[PDB]
Amino acid sequence: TNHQYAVIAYFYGNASLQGANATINIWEPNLKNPNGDFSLTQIWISAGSGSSLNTIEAGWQVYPGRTGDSQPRFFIYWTADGYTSTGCYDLTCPGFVQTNNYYAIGMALQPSVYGGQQYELNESIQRDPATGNWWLYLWGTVVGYWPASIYNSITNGADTVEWGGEIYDSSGTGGFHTTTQMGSGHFPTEGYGKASYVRDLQCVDTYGNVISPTANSFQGIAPAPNCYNYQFQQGSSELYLFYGGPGCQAIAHHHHHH
Ligand SMILES: *[C@@H]1O[C@H](CO)[C@@H](O[C@@H]2O[C@H](CO)[C@@H](O[C@@H]3O[C@H](CO[C@H]4O[C@H](CO)[C@@H](O)[C@H](O[C@H]5O[C@H](CO)[C@@H](O)[C@H](O)[C@@H]5O)[C@@H]4O)[C@@H](O)[C@H](O[C@H]4O[C@H](CO)[C@@H](O)[C@H](O)[C@@H]4O)[C@@H]3O)[C@H](O)[C@H]2NC(C)=O)[C@H](O)[C@H]1NC(C)=O
Ligand SMILES: *[C@@H]1O[C@H](CO)[C@@H](O)[C@H](O)[C@H]1NC(C)=O
């Protein structure tokens, strides 16, 4: 509730996926109500549904009320009961174990420039079959793992992987009437350098083989298309998911009855 999305989903059918990748374009989207709003782009690696839902989450987030500033920051999240009483951001609760401190969890990232310099958050996650732990690698460098000890439905692998943007509307319009930007703050039709994207839309099967689904095998979700949208774009070497938008204007208030 009060969350809005522009994401794609890969439903595998059974909880057997042994990992996934996400190369996420980094931006510093503006927030209409920064004291409560957030804007992020991430991967969701999951198994189950309802209270049995288990997540492995990683990406960037502009959340001033949590991080202290408007910079996009590397964040992680997990849940083992579909967000009722388990899971937390970064290392705020026992769950994720950091083994390599080369990268800081929560590190401020360099935002991309509109029509200019493009930056990328390359994150790779893979389950270790000998333990059930899910390891995180940022730009090839190991960070740590989500232990199998905190999970139930995802202990043997994931059934669903999702990528894309999400905003959190603290104004209570449901994400339907807030100029809190998603991605770059521009609609995906703008393309490279102007609209944000997610590439390396890959996941791993039980045999360690990378699955790179085509646009045909992904389910697009964007319940507020006037505010935030998604768009596949075939690049020279791989499929791109463009996503985001400027948000929507407030509901017209032209009454002036005395
Ligand atoms: C896109 O996503 C793919 C995901 O697969 C990325 O490529 C892979 O990245 C990971 C992480 O960097 C690499 O993992 C490492 O693999 C090595 C080698 O593993 C092989 O050899 C082992 C023996 O030396 C063997 O045990 C392994 O076999 C097991 O797993 C296979 C699954 O393929 C299964 O079939 C077998 O039955 C076995 O159970 C395997 O053949 C491994 O040694 C590394 O281990 C270190 O890290 C782990 C934690 O992650 C830790 O537990 C270990 O103790 C150790 O410290 C590690 O797992 C993988 O090799 C890459 N694959 C390829 C083909 O390159 C890719 O990088 C992503 N791209 C982007 C852009 O993000
Ligand atoms: C799980 O999914 C894989 C891939 O579709 C399939 O081959 C396998 O038979 C499924 N069933 C079981 C019991 O794992």
Residue numbers in the entry: 132 to 380, 401 to 409
From the paper:
The catalytic domain is an atypical 7+8-stranded β-sandwich with an extended active-site cleft containing an unprecedented pair of catalytic glutamates.
The final refined model of the derivative complex was used to solve the native pro-neprosin structure by molecular replacement. Moreover, mature neprosin produced two different monoclinic crystal forms, I and II, whose structures were likewise solved by molecular replacement. The only significant difference was encountered at N232–Y233, which is folded outward in the zymogen to accommodate I103 at the beginning of the rightmost strand of the PD. Moreover, in the structures of mature neprosin crystal forms I and II, the C-terminal segment, which spanned an alanine–isoleucine–alanine tripeptide followed by the His6-tag, ran along the surface of a symmetry mate, thus mimicking a product complex. Even so, the C-terminal tag penetrates the cleft in a similar manner in both crystallographic arrangements but is shifted by three positions, so that H404–H409 from crystal form I overlaps A401–H406 from crystal form II. Indeed, we found a striking pair of glutamate residues (E188 and E297) bridged by a solvent molecule pinching the bound peptides in the product complexes.
